[PDB]
Write an enzyme that holds these catalytic residues in place. Structure first.
Site, PDB file in Angstrom:
ATOM      1  CB  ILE A  77     -31.537 -33.677 -18.975  1.00 33.36           C
ATOM      2  CG1 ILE A  77     -31.711 -35.270 -19.289  1.00 33.36           C
ATOM      3  CG2 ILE A  77     -30.200 -33.326 -19.427  1.00 33.36           C
ATOM      4  CD1 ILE A  77     -32.383 -35.533 -20.671  1.00 33.36           C
ATOM      5  NE  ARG A  79     -34.083 -33.279  -9.342  1.00 31.46           N
ATOM      6  CZ  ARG A  79     -32.533 -33.510  -9.339  1.00 31.46           C
ATOM      7  NH1 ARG A  79     -31.978 -34.654  -9.233  1.00 31.46           N
ATOM      8  NH2 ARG A  79     -31.703 -32.359  -9.205  1.00 31.46           N
ATOM      9  N   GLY A  80     -38.869 -34.693 -11.622  1.00 33.53           N
ATOM     10  CA  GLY A  80     -40.212 -34.569 -11.820  1.00 33.53           C
ATOM     11  C   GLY A  80     -40.696 -35.421 -10.765  1.00 33.53           C
ATOM     12  CG  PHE A  82     -43.181 -40.940  -8.665  1.00 35.84           C
ATOM     13  CD1 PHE A  82     -43.983 -41.351  -7.727  1.00 35.84           C
ATOM     14  CD2 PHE A  82     -44.177 -40.641  -9.808  1.00 35.84           C
ATOM     15  CE1 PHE A  82     -45.433 -41.324  -7.493  1.00 35.84           C
ATOM     16  CE2 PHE A  82     -45.498 -40.619  -9.856  1.00 35.84           C
ATOM     17  CZ  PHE A  82     -46.256 -41.021  -8.544  1.00 35.84           C
ATOM     18  N   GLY A  83     -38.960 -39.258  -8.628  1.00 28.80           N
ATOM     19  CA  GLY A  83     -37.445 -39.256  -8.946  1.00 28.80           C
ATOM     20  C   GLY A  83     -37.125 -38.673 -10.331  1.00 28.80           C
ATOM     21  CD  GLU A  84     -32.134 -38.066 -10.323  1.00 31.15           C
ATOM     22  OE1 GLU A  84     -31.736 -37.029 -10.733  1.00 31.15           O
ATOM     23  OE2 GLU A  84     -31.664 -38.579  -9.163  1.00 31.15           O
ATOM     24  CB  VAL A  85     -35.552 -38.178 -16.958  1.00 29.91           C
ATOM     25  CG1 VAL A  85     -34.744 -38.241 -17.949  1.00 29.91           C
ATOM     26  CG2 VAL A  85     -36.762 -39.127 -16.692  1.00 29.91           C
ATOM     27  CE  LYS A 100     -40.996 -41.172 -16.481  1.00 28.44           C
ATOM     28  NZ  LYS A 100     -42.547 -41.368 -17.281  1.00 28.44           N
ATOM     29  CG  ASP A 193     -49.486 -34.278 -18.678  1.00 25.90           C
ATOM     30  OD1 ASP A 193     -48.523 -34.734 -18.114  1.00 25.90           O
ATOM     31  OD2 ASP A 193     -50.130 -33.030 -18.589  1.00 25.90           O
ATOM     32  CE  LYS A 195     -46.723 -31.271 -18.212  1.00 23.92           C
ATOM     33  NZ  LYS A 195     -47.490 -32.137 -17.639  1.00 23.92           N
ATOM     34  CG  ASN A 198     -45.724 -34.218 -21.270  1.00 24.00           C
ATOM     35  OD1 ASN A 198     -44.632 -34.079 -20.563  1.00 24.00           O
ATOM     36  ND2 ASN A 198     -46.790 -34.421 -20.814  1.00 24.00           N
ATOM     37  CG  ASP A 211     -45.562 -37.912 -19.046  1.00 22.91           C
ATOM     38  OD1 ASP A 211     -46.078 -38.879 -18.532  1.00 22.91           O
ATOM     39  OD2 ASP A 211     -46.095 -36.710 -18.601  1.00 22.91           O
ATOM     40  CB  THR A 232     -49.888 -29.271 -16.893  1.00 21.84           C
ATOM     41  OG1 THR A 232     -48.643 -29.738 -16.555  1.00 21.84           O
ATOM     42  CG2 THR A 232     -49.864 -27.670 -16.661  1.00 21.84           C
TER      43      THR A 232
HETATM   44  N1  LIG Z   1     -36.955 -39.684 -24.139  1.00 18.97           N
HETATM   45  C1  LIG Z   1     -36.478 -38.306 -23.544  1.00 18.97           C
HETATM   46  N2  LIG Z   1     -35.551 -37.559 -24.308  1.00 18.97           N
HETATM   47  C2  LIG Z   1     -34.830 -36.237 -23.969  1.00 18.97           C
HETATM   48  N3  LIG Z   1     -35.440 -35.364 -22.787  1.00 18.97           N
HETATM   49  C3  LIG Z   1     -36.615 -36.194 -22.150  1.00 18.97           C
HETATM   50  C4  LIG Z   1     -36.995 -37.686 -22.462  1.00 18.97           C
HETATM   51  N4  LIG Z   1     -38.111 -38.212 -21.373  1.00 18.97           N
HETATM   52  C5  LIG Z   1     -38.475 -37.160 -20.495  1.00 18.97           C
HETATM   53  N5  LIG Z   1     -37.275 -35.949 -20.780  1.00 18.97           N
HETATM   54  C6  LIG Z   1     -37.230 -34.523 -20.179  1.00 18.97           C
HETATM   55  O1  LIG Z   1     -37.979 -34.736 -18.856  1.00 18.97           O
HETATM   56  C7  LIG Z   1     -38.942 -33.761 -18.634  1.00 18.97           C
HETATM   57  C8  LIG Z   1     -40.410 -34.423 -17.973  1.00 18.97           C
HETATM   58  O2  LIG Z   1     -40.285 -35.788 -18.098  1.00 18.97           O
HETATM   59  P1  LIG Z   1     -41.360 -36.674 -17.294  1.00 18.97           P
HETATM   60  O3  LIG Z   1     -40.645 -38.193 -17.040  1.00 18.97           O
HETATM   61  O4  LIG Z   1     -42.633 -36.806 -17.893  1.00 18.97           O
HETATM   62  O5  LIG Z   1     -41.509 -35.994 -15.855  1.00 18.97           O
HETATM   63  P2  LIG Z   1     -43.013 -35.877 -15.095  1.00 18.97           P
HETATM   64  O6  LIG Z   1     -42.885 -36.901 -13.824  1.00 18.97           O
HETATM   65  O7  LIG Z   1     -44.065 -36.700 -15.882  1.00 18.97           O
HETATM   66  N6  LIG Z   1     -43.641 -34.318 -14.878  1.00 18.97           N
HETATM   67  P3  LIG Z   1     -45.244 -34.329 -14.447  1.00 18.97           P
HETATM   68  O8  LIG Z   1     -45.993 -33.515 -15.754  1.00 18.97           O
HETATM   69  O9  LIG Z   1     -45.415 -33.516 -13.218  1.00 18.97           O
HETATM   70  O10 LIG Z   1     -45.757 -35.723 -14.116  1.00 18.97           O
HETATM   71  C9  LIG Z   1     -39.592 -33.186 -19.960  1.00 18.97           C
HETATM   72  O11 LIG Z   1     -39.677 -31.696 -19.999  1.00 18.97           O
HETATM   73  C10 LIG Z   1     -38.034 -33.357 -20.792  1.00 18.97           C
HETATM   74  O12 LIG Z   1     -37.336 -32.281 -20.383  1.00 18.97           O
HETATM   75 MG   LIG Z   2     -43.451 -33.616 -18.014  1.00 23.56          MG
END
Ligand SMILES: Nc1ncnc2c1ncn2[C@@H]1O[C@H](COP(=O)(O)OP(=O)(O)NP(=O)(O)O)[C@@H](O)[C@H]1O
Ligand SMILES: [Mg+2]
Ligand SMILES: Nc1nc2c(ncn2[C@@H]2O[C@H](COP(=O)(O)OP(=O)(O)OP(=O)(O)O)[C@@H](O)[C@H]2O)c(=O)[nH]1
Ligand SMILES: [Mg+2]
Lengths: 393, 181
Positions: A77, A79-80, A82-85, A100, A193, A195, A198, A211, A232
């Site tokens: 649910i 990607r981002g 460094f890798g996914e969640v 994460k 950050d 938004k 988050n 995050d 962002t």
């Molecule tokens: N504890 C959680 N429960 C449910 N969904 C989550 C949770 N943590 C992260 N997500 C999902 O993952 C997305 C981004 O999470 P995140 O780990 O912050 O990616 P990111 O690498 O930080 N993106 P970026 O802003 O470019 O650094 C969010 O929009 C949510 O949809």
């Molecule tokens: Mg994010």
């Protein structure tokens, strides 16, 4: 004396907030025998006839410490960076957390080998209903892991695109953020950050943040020194921006601005400083006194357009400059519907529709490596002390 | 060797090109106007921890030089088209002449609309004068609603004179037009 030695010591192997609670010294060794298990390095008899010493237990052990495949996974649910969640169910505990993953190799290439340690502290230690609980934090050779309580509501963006937010609502989701920020300020920090990507929603409909990469404990006097831009680019502060290459030095008014830009994306539908270009959305921000503008709408209540314009403005003027309090007092949170200490106590504005232990209806759907050390690299290094479990009563 | 981007400035005469390249690259506003021709300021900027090296090019706005100014375009990284906010005359000109002369010599190079002398927009004198011609200073929207009609990457303003930061905030925006690429 002497007892208070083998005393003050032992309660320093249990202390989770410690750099050396047992779980961390483990994390230590484990991450070393990873950085010496090479033919290249064992031409030296120190490494060789030591890694010999610990083979038959270094194995017996990685076998136990919350290993990665202890979890089987449901949907991915997110990607981002460094890798996914992923949404995972524990193969044994049958409990559903939201894992994460952090790409180790790609995390030392992008030269960010530590931006998370504050996200470890915050998520696991700020016992809070505004913060997303960090249940276990474990690593292996290739990635990192953070098992987090799962939030079935989705981000705030999943919302603003599936509903056309009314003021009744933008009063709610906003002041529940204001609270979860004065949380993270008086937990010592600053987010940066901020938004709708988050902001997540508990099965109760109310809100929590996740995050915390960007975070950073404020100095003695409340400010911070930093010459790198972060977060962002639609929601970026003007101080945090014009810091990118310069004696940047900001307080927490930089989370506040981000909030105004959100009270806007909610009530108008697009962001206030949009523009085709990465550099075009930065120039709208710079010229803010001149570029901020509401459409042909006067249905935007007088005192809402009037709040937006108190956040979206120079930092020495910006609402919240002189207290998190003069924010709660805005003519915009007047209502027969509540006062503040009861907010996350009340009932959501929109309550999640879930079918089972793991309905990801509010969510959408979605192997590189390392170079064999010539000499001794030390890669697995400042990834140590990162482990943390729960057990603590 | 550190990264190095090249930046050219064109614009109607007396719009404040040399007011601004001198403020940024020499930390003082020019005492006496002199019609520059060519001139090569040598600056330095900073995005996120690292140094970009800047090579700035000041030019003439005088048609007398329409024949020579184009010796600076060859192989630029980013060009700044200018107009004096206190004379709408010079903006119906960032369209007649400058879009065309830039479109044709540095075509594969980011261009970028910058409104100078913004501090005159609230001076009772340069209003009292602009009305004696049924004119009236350039409003931000008049500005961008031009830039996005000529193909600029962004429109941005600055008082080359009043607050120093309004100018830094320019070479910040345009370092990024070079390097982001
Ligand atoms: N504890 C959680 N429960 C449910 N969904 C989550 C949770 N943590 C992260 N997500 C999902 O993952 C997305 C981004 O999470 P995140 O780990 O912050 O990616 P990111 O690498 O930080 N993106 P970026 O802003 O470019 O650094 C969010 O929009 C949510 O949809
Ligand atoms: Mg994010
Ligand atoms: N108030 C105000 N006055 C300015 C500003 N910039 C320039 N001036 C005044 O306008 C005059 C024109 O400035 P210059 O930039 O030196 O002239 P130029 O734009 O290079 O014109 P060229 O001859 O084509 O090079 C200067 O003498 C300044 O006194 C500004 O940003 N604000
Ligand atoms: Mg000149």
């Amino acid at each position: 004396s002497f007892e208070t030695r083998f005393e003050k010591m032992d309660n320093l192997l249990r202390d989770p907030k410690s750099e050396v609670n047992s779980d961390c010294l483990l994390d230590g060794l484990d991450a070393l025998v990873y950085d010496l298990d090479f033919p290249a390095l064992r031409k030296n008899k120190n490494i060789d006839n030591f890694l010999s010493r610990y083979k038959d237990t270094i194995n017996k052990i990685r076998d136990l410490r919350m290993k990665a495949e202890d979890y089987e996974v449901v949907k991915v649910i997110g990607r981002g960076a460094f890798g996914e969640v992923q949404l995972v169910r524990h193969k044994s505990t049958r409990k559903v957390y939201a894992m994460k993953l952090l790409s180790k190799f790609e995390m030392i290439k992008r030269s960010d080998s530590a931006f998370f340690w504050e996200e470890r502290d915050i998520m696991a230690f700020a016992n809070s209903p505004w913060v997303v609980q960090l249940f276990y934090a474990f690593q292996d050779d290739r990635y990192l892991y953070m098992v987090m309580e799962y939030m079935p509501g989705g981000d705030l963006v999943n919302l603003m695109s599936n509903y056309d937010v009314p003021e009744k609502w933008a009063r709610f989701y906003t002041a529940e953020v204001v609270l979860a920020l004065d949380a993270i300020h008086s937990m010592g920090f600053i987010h940066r950050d901020v938004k709708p990507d988050n902001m997540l929603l508990d099965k109760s409909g109310h809100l929590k943040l996740a995050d915390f990469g960007t975070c950073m404990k404020m100095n003695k006097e409340g400010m911070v020194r930093c010459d790198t831009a972060v977060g962002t680019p639609d929601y970026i502060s003007p101080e945090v921006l014009k810091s990118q290459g310069g004696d940047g030095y900001y307080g927490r008014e930089c989370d506040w601005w981000s909030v105004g830009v959100f009270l806007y994306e909610m009530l108008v539908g697009d962001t206030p400083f949009y523009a085709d270009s990465l550099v075009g959305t930065y120039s709208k921000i710079m010229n803010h006194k001149n570029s901020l503008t509401f459409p042909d709408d006067n249905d935007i209540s007088k005192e809402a357009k009037n709040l937006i314009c108190a956040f979206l403005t120079d930092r020495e003027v910006r609402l919240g400059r002189n207290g998190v309090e003069e924010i709660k007092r805005h003519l915009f949170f007047k209502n027969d519907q509540w006062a503040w200490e009861t907010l996350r106590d009340t009932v959501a504005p929109v309550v999640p529709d879930l079918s089972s232990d793991i309905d990801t209806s509010n969510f959408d759907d979605l192997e590189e490596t390392f170079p064999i050390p010539k000499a001794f690299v030390g890669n697995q290094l400042p990834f140590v002390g990162f482990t943390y479990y729960s057990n603590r009563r | 060797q550190n990264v190095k981007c090249k930046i050219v400035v064109v614009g109607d005469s007396q719009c404040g090109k040399t007011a601004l390249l001198h403020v940024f690259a020499k930390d003082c506003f020019p005492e006496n106007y002199v019609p520059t021709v060519f001139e090569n300021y040598t600056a330095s900027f900073e995005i996120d921890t690292q140094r970009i090296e800047l090579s700035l090019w000041d030019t003439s706005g005088s048609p007398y030089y329409d024949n020579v100014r184009p010796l600076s375009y060859p192989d630029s990284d980013a060009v700044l088209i200018c107009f004096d906010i206190s004379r709408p005359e010079t903006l119906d000109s960032v369209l007649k002449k400058w879009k065309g002369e830039i479109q044709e010599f540095c075509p594969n190079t980011k261009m970028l609309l910058v409104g100078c002398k913004s501090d005159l927009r609230t001076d009772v004198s340069t209003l009292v004068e602009l009305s004696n011609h049924r004119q009236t200073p350039v409003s931000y929207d008049q500005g961008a609603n031009m830039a996005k009609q000529i193909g600029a990457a962004t429109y941005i303003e600055c008082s080359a004179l009043q607050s120093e930061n309004s100018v830094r905030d320019i070479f910040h925006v345009a370092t990024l037009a070079c390097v982001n690429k």
